[PDB]
Amino acid sequence: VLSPADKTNIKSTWDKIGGHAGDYGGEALDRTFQSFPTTKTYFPHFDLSPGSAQVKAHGKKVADALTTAVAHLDDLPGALSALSDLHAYKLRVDPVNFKLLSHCLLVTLACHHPTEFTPAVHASLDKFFAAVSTVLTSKYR
Amino acid sequence: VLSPADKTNIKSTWDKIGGHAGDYGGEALDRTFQSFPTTKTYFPHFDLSPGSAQVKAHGKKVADALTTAVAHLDDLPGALSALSDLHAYKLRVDPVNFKLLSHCLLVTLACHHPTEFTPAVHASLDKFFAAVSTVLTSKYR
Amino acid sequence: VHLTAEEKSLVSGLWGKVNVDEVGGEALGRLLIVYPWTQRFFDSFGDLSTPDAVMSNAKVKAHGKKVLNSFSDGLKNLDNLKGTFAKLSELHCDKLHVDPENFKLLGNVLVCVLAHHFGKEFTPQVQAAYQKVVAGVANALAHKYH
Amino acid sequence: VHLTAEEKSLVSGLWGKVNVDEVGGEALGRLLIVYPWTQRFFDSFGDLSTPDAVMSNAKVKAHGKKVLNSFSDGLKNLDNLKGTFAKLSELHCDKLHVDPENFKLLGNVLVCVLAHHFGKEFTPQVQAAYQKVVAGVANALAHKYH
Numbered sequence: 221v222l223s224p225a226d227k228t229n230i231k232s233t234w235d236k237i238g239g240h241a242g243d244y245g246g247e248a249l250d251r252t253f254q255s256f257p258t259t260k261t262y263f264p265h266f267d268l269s270p271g272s273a274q275v276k277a278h279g280k281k282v283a284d285a286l287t288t289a290v291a292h293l294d295d296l297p298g299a300l301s302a303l304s305d306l307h308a309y310k311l312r313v314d315p316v317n318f319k320l321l322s323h324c325l326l327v328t329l330a331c332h333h334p335t336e337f338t339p340a341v342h343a344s345l346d347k348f349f350a351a352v353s354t355v356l357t358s359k360y361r
Numbered sequence: 362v363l364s365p366a367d368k369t370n371i372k373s374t375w376d377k378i379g380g381h382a383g384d385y386g387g388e389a390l391d392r393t394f395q396s397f398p399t400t401k402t403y404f405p406h407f408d409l410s411p412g413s414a415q416v417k418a419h420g421k422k423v424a425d426a427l428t429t430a431v432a433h434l435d436d437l438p439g440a441l442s443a444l445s446d447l448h449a450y451k452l453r454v455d456p457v458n459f460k461l462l463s464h465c466l467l468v469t470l471a472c473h474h475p476t477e478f479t480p481a482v483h484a485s486l487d488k489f490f491a492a493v494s495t496v497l498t499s500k501y502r
Numbered sequence: 503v504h505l506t507a508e509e510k511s512l513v514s515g516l517w518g519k520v521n522v523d524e525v526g527g528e529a530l531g532r533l534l535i536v537y538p539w540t541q542r543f544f545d546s547f548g549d550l551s552t553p554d555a556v557m558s559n560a561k562v563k564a565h566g567k568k569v570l571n572s573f574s575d576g577l578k579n580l581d582n583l584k585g586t587f588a589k590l591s592e593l594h595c596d597k598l599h600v601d602p603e604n605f606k607l608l609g610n611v612l613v614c615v616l617a618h619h620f621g622k623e624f625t626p627q628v629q630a631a632y633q634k635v636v637a638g639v640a641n642a643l644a645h646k647y648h
Numbered sequence: 649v650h651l652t653a654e655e656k657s658l659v660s661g662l663w664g665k666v667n668v669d670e671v672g673g674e675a676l677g678r679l680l681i682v683y684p685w686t687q688r689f690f691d692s693f694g695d696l697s698t699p700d701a702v703m704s705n706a707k708v709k710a711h712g713k714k715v716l717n718s719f720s721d722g723l724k725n726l727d728n729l730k731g732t733f734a735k736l737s738e739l740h741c742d743k744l745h746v747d748p749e750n751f752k753l754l755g756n757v758l759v760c761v762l763a764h765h766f767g768k769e770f771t772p773q774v775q776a777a778y779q780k781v782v783a784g785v786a787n788a789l790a791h792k793y794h
């Protein structure tokens with residue numbers, strides 16, 4: 221479902237962003253909350269005001285999770301099992317919200333890395349985020 | 362993403378339907394064409410009138426493909442590679458249509474096997490059809 | 503939504519035979535099991551942790567009956583679905599924050615329940631008619647989101 | 649769709665800077681690559697077999713410019729999107745048979761292209777405003793399906 225070319229595109233793009241990933245996670249969340257206000261209802265405990273320390277810190281966690289996924293493209297269910305438990309069993313996040321965050325991740329990457337964000341890379345990253353979303357919204361105990 | 366329980370539910374349900382699978386494939390197509398007329402535009406070469414030999418024959422092929430999938434739940438991309446080539450590269454079927462056919466497959470099974478069609482089996486079959494749909498709509502050469 | 507006289511008859515013929523005490527709770531129960539994120543909206547309903555818990559849940563059964571009656575309201579008001587469901591659309595959007603995609607899901611689950619209950623009587627022709635109904639109801643409940 | 653004065657300004661400020669010869673073709677091109685089933689509707693457009701073929705496709709570029717102009721029509725008619733797009737909604741439904749979900753996809757791809765072109769200028773605030781626009785256009789083009 222992810223092609224060999226997809227995996228190459230994902231790994232290469234993710235390596236290029238390097239240590240900026242954490243920041244981009246924060247920005248993507250900010251974009252998601254601003255563009256799609258209903259997503260904020262999952263974070264009532266968060267200060268969601270500009271410059272939020274909670275959002276910045278959480279963005280780092282999201283980025284780290286995606287970094288883990290990049291290292292395990294052939295076994296996402298195994299690698300992200302704990303995150304599936306959280307998002308599927310405990311948080312019970314509507315799959316629609318994953319589409320919204322994935323879109324804002326693409327937007328964030330396009331904003332920062334125009335040379336890297338080719339149509340082919342765009343396509344591979346969308347499939348990457350979709351694959352991760354499916355795992356986190358699935359109950360597979 | 363498919364749970365161990367899902368796989369058990371899928372295998373058991375599919376074995377119970379046995380040789381009726383081919384007929385059910387035909388019925389599911391008929392249901393899809395009648396309920397969602399836009400799906401018919403993929404089959405302009407087909408006689409889609411009541412009692413169609415083309416629909417009956419094609420239903421058998423669809424059922425056989427699903428039977429193959431049941432035998433390969435841990436490697437659907439490998440097992441259904443040729444069907445991905447057909448549906449993704451050549452036919453370029455909109456993913457929406459897979460949701461419509463999957464729904465009519467569930468309806469067909471519910472109509473014929475009420476004892477088998479428990480809420481848990483219903484859930485596992487929906488995930489099964491979704492997994493197959495993802496493979497057939499993905500380009501992974 | 504516009505249904506032909508023939509489609510209306512197919513819908514009404516089946517609907518009169520529906521067990522109004524069970525079908526709605528079974529539809530809601532199956533929604534909560536097949537699409538388990540929908541459970542998020544039902545914290546006050548108690549145990550939903552297993553298929554058996556969902557299907558034996560008294561509140562799910564009672565609420566399901568109300569949902570089914572609301573579908574019955576739609577069947578009696580097919581030419582004014584937006585007007586019939588405007589207040590409910592407001593509730594699901596502003597108070598409940600239910601993503602509109604889920605309305606389509608419940609509609610299709612209800613169809614699965616009807617199929618389950620009626621078997622061969624739930625013909626492809628009867629189904630096609632019901633798909634127009636459930637799409638209409640889902641569209642009407644989504645109207646105040648736009 | 650209702651945009652506040654602030655949102656309208658954020659949209660208009662960026663839109664005036666848009667390369668009208670390139671952005672639409674890039675949006676359409678990316679739609680055809682990221683969501684490749686959309687290629688089904690474009691048999692008369694010639695080679696779409698590779699990302700490079702799609703992005704160098706002269707017809708994709710020309711048609712993209714028309715699509716972008718249609719978005720520009722929406723921006724000038726935000727309070728009457730349904731009226732502006734009714735004829736186009738009819739075309740995409742009755743003649744073309746484009747599933748409405750794809751309208752949302754193109755809208756989001758256009759957003760990605762705007763982000764690509766403007767970088768840091770495409771702020772979260774500017775994006776939020778544009779999401780209201782593209783959702784409005786997608787809803788308007790889907791109106792005659794219901």
Ligand code: HEM
Nearest residue numbers: 259262263278281282285286303311313317318321352353
């Ligand atoms: C790209 C897909 C996503 C990834 C990779 C991801 C990753 C993560 C990670 C790593 C955590 C922290 C877990 C821990 O500390 O043990 C987390 C928590 C959380 N996630 Fe996600 N997530 C994703 C999508 C979403 C979406 C779409 C939502 C809903 C809008 C959501 C809602 C939450 C919430 C509410 C928490 C708890 C935050 C806290 O209390 O600190 N997640 N996620």
Ligand code: HEM
Nearest residue numbers: 400403404419422423426427444452454458459462493494
């Ligand atoms: C459950 C998912 C599906 C399965 C398992 C499936 C399976 C198959 C199989 C086995 C064939 C015959 C291939 C061959 O003879 O080499 C086929 C062909 C075809 N499929 Fe599907 N399919 C699915 C979904 C769909 C959908 C949703 C559509 C569009 C509405 C579609 C459109 C077609 C068409 C137009 C053909 C060619 C038929 C012919 O010319 O005889 N398929 N599919």
Ligand code: HEM
Nearest residue numbers: 540543544546568569572573598600604605608609639643
């Ligand atoms: C198929 C379309 C639907 C119909 C016709 C429908 C109908 C209704 C009705 C009649 C009520 C009671 C209103 C009242 O007395 O205040 C209600 C409430 C409610 N609905 Fe729905 N509904 C639909 C879809 C959904 C979906 C898909 C969800 C969630 C995924 C949902 C979640 C809720 C919740 C959480 C309540 C309040 C329950 C409570 O706490 O008492 N509804 N709905």
Ligand code: HEM
Nearest residue numbers: 686689690692714715718719744746750751754755785789
């Ligand atoms: C984002 C919303 C969209 C807008 C604003 C839009 C706009 C337009 C416009 C202005 C035309 C030309 C009408 C004419 O001169 O006759 C057109 C035609 C067309 N559209 Fe779209 N469109 C949208 C979405 C889509 C999508 C998502 C698809 C396919 C997935 C699509 C497929 C087509 C096709 C195949 C044509 C005819 C092209 C030809 O053969 O000349 N459109 N659209």
